[PDB]
Amino acid sequence: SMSYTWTGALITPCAAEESKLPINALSNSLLRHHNMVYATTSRSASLRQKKVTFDRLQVLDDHYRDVLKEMKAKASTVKAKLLSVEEACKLTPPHSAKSKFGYGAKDVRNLSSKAVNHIHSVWKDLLEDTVTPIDTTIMAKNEVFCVQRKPARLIVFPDLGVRVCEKMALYDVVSTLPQVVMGSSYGFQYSPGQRVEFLVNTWKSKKNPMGFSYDTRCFDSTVTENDIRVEESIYQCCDLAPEARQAIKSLTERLYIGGPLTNSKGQNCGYRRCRASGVLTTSCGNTLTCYLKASAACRAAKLQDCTMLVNGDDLVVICESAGVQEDAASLRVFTEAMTRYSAPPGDPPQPEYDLELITSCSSNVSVAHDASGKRVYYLTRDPTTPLARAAWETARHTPVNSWLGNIIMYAPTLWARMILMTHFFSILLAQEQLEKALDCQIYGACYSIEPLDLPQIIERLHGLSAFSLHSYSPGEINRVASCLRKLGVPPLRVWRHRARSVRARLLSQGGRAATCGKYLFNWAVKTKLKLTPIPAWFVAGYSGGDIYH
Ligand SMILES: CC(C)C[C@@]1(C(=O)O)C[C@H](C(=O)O)[C@H](c2nccs2)N1C(=O)c1ccc(C(C)(C)C)cc1
Question: Does ligand 1 come within 6 angstroms of the Cβ of 282?
């Protein structure tokens, strides 16, 4: 079973594509080494096609079926409802790709008779026909990185009308089923504060902790027809309306399992027999399947008191050490089992005995201290990709503002606070756009957020301590500092100076602006203001699922 077959028609862009970092008058103030930042384009799609295209073999044993039965028993306790057309329309992002059939995302949200009538017709066809593959578009993503070049990632998605029907049939299921089935292991239920707390508590719950990340090579491609049918059998355990059962069976047979791929010019590029990246069930499906395969590999490997944390294809296991030699051997058996289940590693997993050395959701635990000097754990990452993207967004308006998502999700970090907040608040001040709502993504869902709302968002997701962290670790400081030399970003001392300016400017404006100056930039003044609570999201993952929050 090959993950894809190809005709030889090219994956085509739908618009002009920039690969070189755009530069304006603000660029050099953030980043000098411009030639290190690039965006992927369709020109590299051929290279990605080669990576994602392979044969899958699967060998399924008793541990696999044992975990599956347990998951199904939990899933049987879920009661889910159909969403009305209206409800599903309201979940559609304002800038979601328009339909081939003469209406767009705004027509959908506005419940135009054209959009609604077509959606009813798509729904009825799902009920009537559980056989015919549904068309999908394949595109090369344009994403920004620092050199050391990756090929474009590919996205596969059905028409807007289908996307709305998906929401009707499955939004409630994908929202509620995974936490029921996986409990505390379900990663999307945690804000960053809750996630770091769960990781630390999980780590402290072991007599002698051992943990590891497992990186599956090209997870979407490893997903087989079996996996997707197993997923459907899980959804079908829920207490559902008969009409929902039928639409889910239909979406599975006609879309989820596979189908034809069409380029932006309407030419046939080939055929998919693996996970589509751009459907509603991508995140929930990947999470279930990763959790199933890994729970079964843990038993194969005889790992003791395994605690998993799963976000799609992102997987972390923390368990009881059996000793160093025993743990390394167990990890090999875990990997052999994952491989048989069709999920071979990209890089071999490594046992860790220090929590801060485990990377999960591209992040690691680290520690700083609050106002009182008490230890605070928080999640951070190498800032290289966030800063390359910030540089891009400095000179170019983009559909999604990663700088804003990074400020929200990495608010307690040295680099988000000193660089991202300082840089973008300065830019927003200059343009008097503090009040302008901007689109960003959190766990792949789309939010419209005004920068002026940041103080309360951060306090909720991270705690008040986020505004007073200091004495960061030498390792964390060292990683940030070396990233800045690599990219030609000004040293942290320059950012401190800039932040004092930005801060003073914000305070003057009173109201919300002054709240941003006071809370976001307290780290920048030598005699700190006493920071006190302020007056005036994490249920499930929907990456690729076209969800507006
Ligand atoms: C600008 C980003 C903040 C947006 C992004 C997204 O999924 O839409 C993409 C980000 C990415 O790494 O691709 C990050 C995610 N990491 C792992 C899964 S999702 N993203 C997160 O939303 C995200 C950041 C940080 C975190 C933790 C710090 C690990 C809580 C979870 C999720």
Answer: no
